[PDB]
Amino acid sequence: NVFQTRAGCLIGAEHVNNSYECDIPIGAGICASYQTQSIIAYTMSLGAENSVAYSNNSIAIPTNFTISV
Amino acid sequence: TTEILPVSMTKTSVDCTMYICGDSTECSNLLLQYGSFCTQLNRALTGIAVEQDKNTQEVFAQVKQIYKTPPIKDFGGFNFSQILPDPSKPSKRSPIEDLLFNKVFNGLTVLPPLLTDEMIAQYTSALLAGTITSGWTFGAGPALQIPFPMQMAYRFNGIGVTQNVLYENQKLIANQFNSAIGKIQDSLSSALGKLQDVVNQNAQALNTLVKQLSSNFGAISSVLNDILSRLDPPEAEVQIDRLITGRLQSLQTYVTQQLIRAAEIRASANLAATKMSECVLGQSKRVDFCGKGYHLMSFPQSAPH
Amino acid sequence: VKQLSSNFGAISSVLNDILSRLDPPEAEVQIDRLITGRLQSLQTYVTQQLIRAAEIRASANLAATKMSECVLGQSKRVDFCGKGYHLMSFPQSAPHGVVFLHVTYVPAQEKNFTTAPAICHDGKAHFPREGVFVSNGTHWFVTQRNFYEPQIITTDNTFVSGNCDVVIGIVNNTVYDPLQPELD
Numbered sequence A: 001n002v003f004q005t006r007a008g009c010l011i012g013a014e015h016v017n018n019s020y021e022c023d024i025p026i027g028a029g030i031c032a033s034y035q036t037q038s039i040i041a042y043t044m045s046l047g048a049e050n051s052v053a054y055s056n057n058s059i060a061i062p063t064n065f066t067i068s069v
Numbered sequence B: 001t002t003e004i005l006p007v008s009m010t011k012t013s014v015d016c017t018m019y020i021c022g023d024s025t026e027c028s029n030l031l032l033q034y035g036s037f038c039t040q041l042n043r044a045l046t047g048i049a050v051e052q053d054k055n056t057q058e059v060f061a062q063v064k065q066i067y068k069t070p071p072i073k074d075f076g077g078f079n080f081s082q083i084l085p086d087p088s089k090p091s092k093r094s095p096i097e098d099l100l101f102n103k104v105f106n107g108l109t110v111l112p113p114l115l116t117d118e119m120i121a122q123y124t125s126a127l128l129a130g131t132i133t134s135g136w137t138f139g140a141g142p143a144l145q146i147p148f149p150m151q152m153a154y155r156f157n158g159i160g161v162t163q164n165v166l167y168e169n170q171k172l173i174a175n176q177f178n179s180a181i182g183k184i185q186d187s188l189s190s191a192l193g194k195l196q197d198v199v200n201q202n203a204q205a206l207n208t209l210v211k212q213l214s215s216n217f218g219a220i221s222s223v224l225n226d227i228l229s230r231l232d233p234p235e236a237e238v239q240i241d242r243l244i245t246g247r248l249q250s251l252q253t254y255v256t257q258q259l260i261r262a263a264e265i266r267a268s269a270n271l272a273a274t275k276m277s278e279c280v281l282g283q284s285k286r287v288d289f290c291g292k293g294y295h296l297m298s299f300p301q302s303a304p305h
Numbered sequence C: 001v002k003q004l005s006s007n008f009g010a011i012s013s014v015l016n017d018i019l020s021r022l023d024p025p026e027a028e029v030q031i032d033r034l035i036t037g038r039l040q041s042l043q044t045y046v047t048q049q050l051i052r053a054a055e056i057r058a059s060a061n062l063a064a065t066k067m068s069e070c071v072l073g074q075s076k077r078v079d080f081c082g083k084g085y086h087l088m089s090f091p092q093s094a095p096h097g098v099v100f101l102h103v104t105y106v107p108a109q110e111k112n113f114t115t116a117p118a119i120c121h122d123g124k125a126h127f128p129r130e131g132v133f134v135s136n137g138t139h140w141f142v143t144q145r146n147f148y149e150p151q152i153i154t155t156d157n158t159f160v161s162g163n164c165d166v167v168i169g170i171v172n173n174t175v176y177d178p179l180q181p182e183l184d
């Protein structure tokens, strides 16, 4: 219902706990979006996480390619 | 060496009516006779407050994944501990990102930026873990790991030295690098004038805007509750218009100089976005574009703006 | 256009009706407020056109530089001509602009291998001429760095510099010389 951000007071949007890509910027890290059917407000996500299998004698070499336009 | 660049400035909004009249229906009705000047001023300020977030998005969101560095960190003798994130610190910043964050009413509001400082420090740590661990491969596709000294040997090839010159001088090259990263920390801990100047200019302009709410411009006072108390309505119109004209002039001067200052911040952020592409996700051959000498590699660090 | 219908504190917005109602002695009063307001309108329009033309000029200079460096050549600047290793670009015209079609190469389907900086053979350190030493688990090859294409390590794709006691990570393997089985 009523949710307090750092951008101000927001009425009419539910505060979910998951993080999506930003859809409508609210500010100070919060975005809003029409999901499912209702309007939700969330902290944006920067992207998916990734650890690289770094070691001191390992290398990754590609075996194919794509042409991109 | 270091290079400092401004990417953003502060997003401000004004409310024309509350600045010129200050919640008084007499002034507000006279103001309607001036047309739509105060919808234009707001359109201009909104257009420059949206591009401040566009400026940051194009310098820092240059990754798809958020890369993390390995727990056991053996990079051939090279030591990146003063530029890698520190969990016991505020906002999970690096040690050198902290020294940088420590060195630098009436219709007026300040809007917050869309990306917090935590998010931008996250972006720079993903760039920095991508380059320590994959070289320049993650800026062209999927990140492919390579040992750090073999990456250093490829970069030596890129400036026209052979690889045995790196492999036979590994410990000396690593000691020189560590000792030279140790001096950035002293020289800063003991220089951010380009970032300080854009803060100062904006504050000096916002203060001049408010200090104009106390000039007569050729009227009996500067207060509307004083012209509405010792003048009858036919005589207070002539005195209110003299204030309206002056305050409109001052607000529009403020809005022109902000357009001219934002067009300059925009070019700086456009250069920072090109340096992030060409010095951090690549090795540049352009002379004096990524330092002075022969470019080997570059590391980003976030600063206040 | 729409600011032509404000009074700016006069009796009428239409000067034909300003000259119809208040005349010369008083038109020097009512016509002057219209002149003052309309002049300011026009000046705001011209200043904001000058600031916007300077932004269009920066864009057109960048598009000229991309036409020279992406269509009339092959660029090495990362991200200047699309994401990936630039191969070529084609221009297309648009209503007030230009569309560049960037063709790039994107590597795919990477595999894991074991690496070494140098090979040790006969008390000598061998380095690849252009590539990397890789192991499939049991055998050592040289390959080019962007496409997997393994070859035998010979004295024609390596060079020698020093002993195998100074470089950190040498492995022991054999460097095949073609000439010897040639002349027996």
Ligand SMILES: *[C@@H]1O[C@H](CO)[C@@H](O[C@@H]2O[C@H](CO)[C@@H](O)[C@H](O)[C@H]2NC(C)=O)[C@H](O)[C@H]1NC(C)=O
Binding pocket: B079, B080, B081, B082
């Ligand atoms: C990388 O360099 C840092 C120095 O900035 C080393 O960390 C410090 O080393 C001194 C000397 O032993 C200690 O007194 C500090 O407590 C260390 N930690 C700090 C200052 O946070 C670090 O050990 C080096 N890394 C390696 C692998 O040698």
Ligand SMILES: *[C@@H]1O[C@H](CO)[C@@H](O[C@@H]2O[C@H](CO)[C@@H](O)[C@H](O)[C@H]2NC(C)=O)[C@H](O)[C@H]1NC(C)=O
Binding pocket: A053, A060, C110, C111, C112
């Ligand atoms: C190269 O080997 C590493 C390490 O063996 C692989 O890293 C794996 O990554 C996954 C992530 O989904 C982890 O869950 C595994 O624990 C890691 N180790 C494994 C599978 O042994 C990496 O995927 C390999 N790279 C390629 C291209 O096959």
Ligand SMILES: *[C@@H]1O[C@H](CO)[C@@H](O[C@@H]2O[C@H](CO)[C@@H](O)[C@H](O)[C@H]2NC(C)=O)[C@H](O)[C@H]1NC(C)=O
Binding pocket: C136, C137, C138, C139
């Ligand atoms: C690594 O590659 C080598 C050479 O490509 C493999 O050795 C050959 O494997 C084939 C399998 O059919 C045999 O017929 C050959 O006799 C082998 N020796 C040669 C060509 O000299 C080896 O099996 C590969 N190792 C792994 C773990 O895949």
Ligand SMILES: *[C@@H]1O[C@H](CO)[C@@H](O[C@@H]2O[C@H](CO)[C@@H](O)[C@H](O)[C@H]2NC(C)=O)[C@H](O)[C@H]1NC(C)=O
Binding pocket: A056, A057, C168, C169
């Ligand atoms: C690369 O890292 C590996 C593992 O971290 C190193 O292997 C270690 O080598 C030391 C001395 O050579 C041994 O005392 C350790 O027991 C080894 N670790 C394991 C898990 O076996 C290796 O030396 C490093 N350097 C290279 C490969 O050049």
Ligand SMILES: *[C@@H]1O[C@H](CO)[C@@H](O[C@@H]2O[C@H](CO)[C@@H](O)[C@H](O)[C@H]2NC(C)=O)[C@H](O)[C@H]1NC(C)=O
Binding pocket: C172
């Ligand atoms: C690689 O082979 C060399 C010999 O060609 C080995 O060198 C010997 O190393 C032992 C132990 O360090 C010494 O006692 C011998 O005197 C060395 N002999 C020579 C001719 O140098 C070396 O140990 C081997 N290393 C590996 C990893 O296989």
Ligand SMILES: *[C@@H]1O[C@H](CO)[C@@H](O)[C@H](O)[C@H]1NC(C)=O
Binding pocket: A015, A016, A017
């Ligand atoms: C969101 O997650 C936090 C976890 O700390 C929890 O306390 C909170 O109740 C959650 N809110 C909703 C709406 O699920």
